[PDB]
PDB file of all heavy atoms in Angstrom:
ATOM      1  N   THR D   5     180.184 296.830 250.807  1.00105.41           N
ATOM      2  CA  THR D   5     179.609 296.739 252.141  1.00105.41           C
ATOM      3  C   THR D   5     179.225 298.104 252.710  1.00105.41           C
ATOM      4  O   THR D   5     179.373 298.330 253.917  1.00105.41           O
ATOM      5  CB  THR D   5     180.583 296.023 253.080  1.00105.41           C
ATOM      6  OG1 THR D   5     181.333 295.056 252.335  1.00105.41           O
ATOM      7  CG2 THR D   5     179.825 295.296 254.183  1.00105.41           C
ATOM      8  N   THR D   8     176.033 298.296 255.486  1.00111.40           N
ATOM      9  CA  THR D   8     176.358 298.184 256.903  1.00111.40           C
ATOM     10  C   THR D   8     177.001 299.468 257.416  1.00111.40           C
ATOM     11  O   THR D   8     176.613 300.001 258.462  1.00111.40           O
ATOM     12  CB  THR D   8     177.279 296.986 257.139  1.00111.40           C
ATOM     13  OG1 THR D   8     176.683 295.806 256.584  1.00111.40           O
ATOM     14  CG2 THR D   8     177.511 296.779 258.628  1.00111.40           C
ATOM     15  N   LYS D  41     187.800 311.100 238.950  1.00 78.66           N
ATOM     16  CA  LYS D  41     189.029 310.312 238.884  1.00 78.66           C
ATOM     17  C   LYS D  41     189.484 310.070 237.449  1.00 78.66           C
ATOM     18  O   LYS D  41     190.682 310.132 237.155  1.00 78.66           O
ATOM     19  CB  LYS D  41     188.845 308.983 239.615  1.00 78.66           C
ATOM     20  CG  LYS D  41     189.821 308.785 240.758  1.00 78.66           C
ATOM     21  CD  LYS D  41     190.214 307.326 240.899  1.00 78.66           C
ATOM     22  CE  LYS D  41     190.990 307.084 242.182  1.00 78.66           C
ATOM     23  NZ  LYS D  41     191.642 305.747 242.187  1.00 78.66           N
ATOM     24  N   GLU D  47     196.991 313.052 233.296  1.00 77.73           N
ATOM     25  CA  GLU D  47     197.531 314.345 233.705  1.00 77.73           C
ATOM     26  C   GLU D  47     198.965 314.535 233.223  1.00 77.73           C
ATOM     27  O   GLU D  47     199.330 315.611 232.736  1.00 77.73           O
ATOM     28  CB  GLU D  47     197.446 314.485 235.225  1.00 77.73           C
ATOM     29  CG  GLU D  47     197.820 313.228 235.987  1.00 77.73           C
ATOM     30  CD  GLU D  47     197.467 313.314 237.457  1.00 77.73           C
ATOM     31  OE1 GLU D  47     196.964 314.370 237.890  1.00 77.73           O
ATOM     32  OE2 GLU D  47     197.688 312.324 238.182  1.00 77.73           O
ATOM     33  N   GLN D  48     199.795 313.502 233.348  1.00 77.73           N
ATOM     34  CA  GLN D  48     201.173 313.602 232.884  1.00 77.73           C
ATOM     35  C   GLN D  48     201.365 313.028 231.488  1.00 77.73           C
ATOM     36  O   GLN D  48     202.258 313.477 230.761  1.00 77.73           O
ATOM     37  CB  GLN D  48     202.120 312.905 233.867  1.00 77.73           C
ATOM     38  CG  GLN D  48     203.584 313.247 233.642  1.00 77.73           C
ATOM     39  CD  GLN D  48     204.518 312.556 234.616  1.00 77.73           C
ATOM     40  OE1 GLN D  48     205.730 312.751 234.570  1.00 77.73           O
ATOM     41  NE2 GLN D  48     203.958 311.749 235.505  1.00 77.73           N
ATOM     42  N   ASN D  62     209.462 316.181 232.834  1.00 86.60           N
ATOM     43  CA  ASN D  62     209.326 315.575 234.155  1.00 86.60           C
ATOM     44  C   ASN D  62     209.403 316.618 235.262  1.00 86.60           C
ATOM     45  O   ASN D  62     208.585 316.609 236.187  1.00 86.60           O
ATOM     46  CB  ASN D  62     210.401 314.507 234.357  1.00 86.60           C
ATOM     47  CG  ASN D  62     209.970 313.148 233.859  1.00 86.60           C
ATOM     48  OD1 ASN D  62     208.999 313.028 233.113  1.00 86.60           O
ATOM     49  ND2 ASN D  62     210.686 312.112 234.271  1.00 86.60           N
ATOM     50  N   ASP D  66     206.308 318.110 237.712  1.00 84.54           N
ATOM     51  CA  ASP D  66     206.494 317.994 239.153  1.00 84.54           C
ATOM     52  C   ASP D  66     206.423 319.354 239.833  1.00 84.54           C
ATOM     53  O   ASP D  66     205.899 319.475 240.945  1.00 84.54           O
ATOM     54  CB  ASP D  66     207.830 317.318 239.454  1.00 84.54           C
ATOM     55  CG  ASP D  66     207.926 316.836 240.881  1.00 84.54           C
ATOM     56  OD1 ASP D  66     207.092 316.004 241.286  1.00 84.54           O
ATOM     57  OD2 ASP D  66     208.834 317.296 241.600  1.00 84.54           O
ATOM     58  N   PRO D  70     202.786 319.354 242.405  1.00 81.04           N
ATOM     59  CA  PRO D  70     203.508 318.566 243.418  1.00 81.04           C
ATOM     60  C   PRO D  70     202.684 317.427 243.986  1.00 81.04           C
ATOM     61  O   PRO D  70     203.231 316.365 244.297  1.00 81.04           O
ATOM     62  CB  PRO D  70     203.856 319.613 244.486  1.00 81.04           C
ATOM     63  CG  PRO D  70     202.878 320.706 244.285  1.00 81.04           C
ATOM     64  CD  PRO D  70     202.613 320.756 242.818  1.00 81.04           C
ATOM     65  N   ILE D  71     201.381 317.625 244.141  1.00 78.95           N
ATOM     66  CA  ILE D  71     200.463 316.572 244.555  1.00 78.95           C
ATOM     67  C   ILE D  71     199.176 316.761 243.764  1.00 78.95           C
ATOM     68  O   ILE D  71     198.674 317.882 243.649  1.00 78.95           O
ATOM     69  CB  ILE D  71     200.211 316.603 246.079  1.00 78.95           C
ATOM     70  CG1 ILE D  71     198.993 315.768 246.469  1.00 78.95           C
ATOM     71  CG2 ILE D  71     200.075 318.019 246.579  1.00 78.95           C
ATOM     72  CD1 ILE D  71     199.169 314.308 246.216  1.00 78.95           C
ATOM     73  N   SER D  72     198.654 315.673 243.207  1.00 84.56           N
ATOM     74  CA  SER D  72     197.503 315.752 242.318  1.00 84.56           C
ATOM     75  C   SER D  72     196.249 316.191 243.070  1.00 84.56           C
ATOM     76  O   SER D  72     196.113 315.979 244.277  1.00 84.56           O
ATOM     77  CB  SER D  72     197.263 314.402 241.644  1.00 84.56           C
ATOM     78  OG  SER D  72     196.174 314.463 240.743  1.00 84.56           O
ATOM     79  N   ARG D  75     194.312 313.144 244.438  1.00 82.51           N
ATOM     80  CA  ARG D  75     194.970 312.587 245.613  1.00 82.51           C
ATOM     81  C   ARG D  75     194.797 313.498 246.821  1.00 82.51           C
ATOM     82  O   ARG D  75     194.726 313.022 247.959  1.00 82.51           O
ATOM     83  CB  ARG D  75     196.450 312.349 245.324  1.00 82.51           C
ATOM     84  CG  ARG D  75     196.817 310.897 245.092  1.00 82.51           C
ATOM     85  CD  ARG D  75     196.522 310.488 243.665  1.00 82.51           C
ATOM     86  NE  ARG D  75     197.473 311.081 242.734  1.00 82.51           N
ATOM     87  CZ  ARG D  75     197.486 310.857 241.428  1.00 82.51           C
ATOM     88  NH1 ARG D  75     196.596 310.068 240.853  1.00 82.51           N
ATOM     89  NH2 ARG D  75     198.417 311.440 240.679  1.00 82.51           N
TER      90      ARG D  75
ATOM     91  N   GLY F   4     185.906 292.893 250.070  1.00 93.18           N
ATOM     92  CA  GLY F   4     184.481 292.977 250.348  1.00 93.18           C
ATOM     93  C   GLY F   4     184.099 292.541 251.750  1.00 93.18           C
ATOM     94  O   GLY F   4     183.113 293.042 252.300  1.00 93.18           O
ATOM     95  N   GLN F   7     184.211 293.540 257.066  1.00 91.55           N
ATOM     96  CA  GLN F   7     183.329 293.686 258.221  1.00 91.55           C
ATOM     97  C   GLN F   7     183.433 292.489 259.159  1.00 91.55           C
ATOM     98  O   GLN F   7     183.377 292.637 260.385  1.00 91.55           O
ATOM     99  CB  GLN F   7     181.890 293.886 257.744  1.00 91.55           C
ATOM    100  CG  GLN F   7     180.863 293.972 258.856  1.00 91.55           C
ATOM    101  CD  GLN F   7     179.505 293.454 258.429  1.00 91.55           C
ATOM    102  OE1 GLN F   7     178.949 293.893 257.422  1.00 91.55           O
ATOM    103  NE2 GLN F   7     178.964 292.514 259.194  1.00 91.55           N
ATOM    104  N   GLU F  42     198.419 304.491 242.709  1.00104.31           N
ATOM    105  CA  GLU F  42     198.378 305.063 241.366  1.00104.31           C
ATOM    106  C   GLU F  42     199.505 306.064 241.136  1.00104.31           C
ATOM    107  O   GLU F  42     199.843 306.355 239.984  1.00104.31           O
ATOM    108  CB  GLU F  42     197.024 305.723 241.108  1.00104.31           C
ATOM    109  CG  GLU F  42     196.761 306.957 241.951  1.00104.31           C
ATOM    110  CD  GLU F  42     195.333 307.021 242.453  1.00104.31           C
ATOM    111  OE1 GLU F  42     194.945 306.138 243.244  1.00104.31           O
ATOM    112  OE2 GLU F  42     194.602 307.957 242.066  1.00104.31           O
ATOM    113  N   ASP F  46     203.426 304.864 236.810  1.00 96.37           N
ATOM    114  CA  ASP F  46     204.318 305.098 235.681  1.00 96.37           C
ATOM    115  C   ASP F  46     205.769 305.284 236.111  1.00 96.37           C
ATOM    116  O   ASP F  46     206.489 306.088 235.513  1.00 96.37           O
ATOM    117  CB  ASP F  46     203.845 306.312 234.881  1.00 96.37           C
ATOM    118  CG  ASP F  46     203.584 307.518 235.757  1.00 96.37           C
ATOM    119  OD1 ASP F  46     202.771 307.407 236.698  1.00 96.37           O
ATOM    120  OD2 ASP F  46     204.195 308.577 235.514  1.00 96.37           O
ATOM    121  N   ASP F  50     207.669 306.498 232.773  1.00 93.89           N
ATOM    122  CA  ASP F  50     208.031 307.905 232.686  1.00 93.89           C
ATOM    123  C   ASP F  50     209.445 308.180 233.179  1.00 93.89           C
ATOM    124  O   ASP F  50     209.815 309.345 233.350  1.00 93.89           O
ATOM    125  CB  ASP F  50     207.025 308.756 233.462  1.00 93.89           C
ATOM    126  CG  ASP F  50     205.738 308.978 232.696  1.00 93.89           C
ATOM    127  OD1 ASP F  50     205.062 307.984 232.361  1.00 93.89           O
ATOM    128  OD2 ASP F  50     205.400 310.148 232.424  1.00 93.89           O
ATOM    129  N   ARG F 150     214.958 314.632 241.915  1.00 94.51           N
ATOM    130  CA  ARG F 150     214.536 314.738 240.523  1.00 94.51           C
ATOM    131  C   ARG F 150     215.544 314.086 239.585  1.00 94.51           C
ATOM    132  O   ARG F 150     215.162 313.479 238.579  1.00 94.51           O
ATOM    133  CB  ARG F 150     214.332 316.205 240.145  1.00 94.51           C
ATOM    134  CG  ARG F 150     213.002 316.776 240.584  1.00 94.51           C
ATOM    135  CD  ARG F 150     212.926 318.265 240.330  1.00 94.51           C
ATOM    136  NE  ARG F 150     211.611 318.799 240.658  1.00 94.51           N
ATOM    137  CZ  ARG F 150     211.294 320.086 240.621  1.00 94.51           C
ATOM    138  NH1 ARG F 150     212.178 321.006 240.274  1.00 94.51           N
ATOM    139  NH2 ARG F 150     210.059 320.458 240.943  1.00 94.51           N
ATOM    140  N   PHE F 166     215.908 311.109 234.973  1.00108.38           N
ATOM    141  CA  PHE F 166     214.914 311.933 235.644  1.00108.38           C
ATOM    142  C   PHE F 166     213.748 311.083 236.125  1.00108.38           C
ATOM    143  O   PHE F 166     213.218 310.252 235.382  1.00108.38           O
ATOM    144  CB  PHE F 166     214.430 313.048 234.717  1.00108.38           C
ATOM    145  CG  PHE F 166     215.514 314.011 234.333  1.00108.38           C
ATOM    146  CD1 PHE F 166     216.322 313.765 233.236  1.00108.38           C
ATOM    147  CD2 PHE F 166     215.749 315.144 235.089  1.00108.38           C
ATOM    148  CE1 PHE F 166     217.328 314.639 232.891  1.00108.38           C
ATOM    149  CE2 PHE F 166     216.754 316.022 234.747  1.00108.38           C
ATOM    150  CZ  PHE F 166     217.544 315.769 233.646  1.00108.38           C
ATOM    151  N   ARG F 169     207.262 312.148 239.019  1.00106.93           N
ATOM    152  CA  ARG F 169     206.568 312.618 240.214  1.00106.93           C
ATOM    153  C   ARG F 169     207.379 312.478 241.508  1.00106.93           C
ATOM    154  O   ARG F 169     206.902 311.891 242.482  1.00106.93           O
ATOM    155  CB  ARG F 169     205.229 311.908 240.365  1.00106.93           C
ATOM    156  CG  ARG F 169     204.426 311.733 239.090  1.00106.93           C
ATOM    157  CD  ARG F 169     203.431 310.590 239.252  1.00106.93           C
ATOM    158  NE  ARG F 169     202.581 310.399 238.083  1.00106.93           N
ATOM    159  CZ  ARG F 169     201.506 311.123 237.806  1.00106.93           C
ATOM    160  NH1 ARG F 169     201.111 312.107 238.596  1.00106.93           N
ATOM    161  NH2 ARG F 169     200.808 310.851 236.708  1.00106.93           N
ATOM    162  N   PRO F 170     208.605 313.014 241.556  1.00108.37           N
ATOM    163  CA  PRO F 170     209.400 312.860 242.787  1.00108.37           C
ATOM    164  C   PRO F 170     208.820 313.584 243.991  1.00108.37           C
ATOM    165  O   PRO F 170     209.009 313.130 245.125  1.00108.37           O
ATOM    166  CB  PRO F 170     210.770 313.423 242.390  1.00108.37           C
ATOM    167  CG  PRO F 170     210.494 314.334 241.271  1.00108.37           C
ATOM    168  CD  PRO F 170     209.342 313.759 240.522  1.00108.37           C
ATOM    169  N   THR F 171     208.125 314.703 243.783  1.00110.45           N
ATOM    170  CA  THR F 171     207.593 315.458 244.914  1.00110.45           C
ATOM    171  C   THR F 171     206.379 314.768 245.525  1.00110.45           C
ATOM    172  O   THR F 171     206.240 314.718 246.752  1.00110.45           O
ATOM    173  CB  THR F 171     207.242 316.882 244.481  1.00110.45           C
ATOM    174  OG1 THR F 171     208.409 317.521 243.954  1.00110.45           O
ATOM    175  CG2 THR F 171     206.733 317.687 245.659  1.00110.45           C
ATOM    176  N   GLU F 172     205.489 314.233 244.687  1.00115.05           N
ATOM    177  CA  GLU F 172     204.326 313.519 245.201  1.00115.05           C
ATOM    178  C   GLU F 172     204.742 312.268 245.958  1.00115.05           C
ATOM    179  O   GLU F 172     204.142 311.921 246.981  1.00115.05           O
ATOM    180  CB  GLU F 172     203.379 313.162 244.055  1.00115.05           C
ATOM    181  CG  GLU F 172     201.983 312.778 244.501  1.00115.05           C
ATOM    182  CD  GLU F 172     200.976 312.825 243.371  1.00115.05           C
ATOM    183  OE1 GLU F 172     201.355 313.230 242.252  1.00115.05           O
ATOM    184  OE2 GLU F 172     199.807 312.456 243.596  1.00115.05           O
TER     185      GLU F 172
END
Side-chain angles (χ1 to χ4, degrees):
Chain D
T5 328
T8 306
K41 239 214 190 193
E47 42 191 358
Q48 194 180 181
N62 272 15
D66 195 60
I71 165 66
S72 182
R75 256 82 72 177
Chain F
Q7 177 210 306
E42 67 220 65
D46 50 303
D50 281 60
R150 279 173 176 175
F166 297 87
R169 318 158 178 280
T171 302
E172 196 163 356

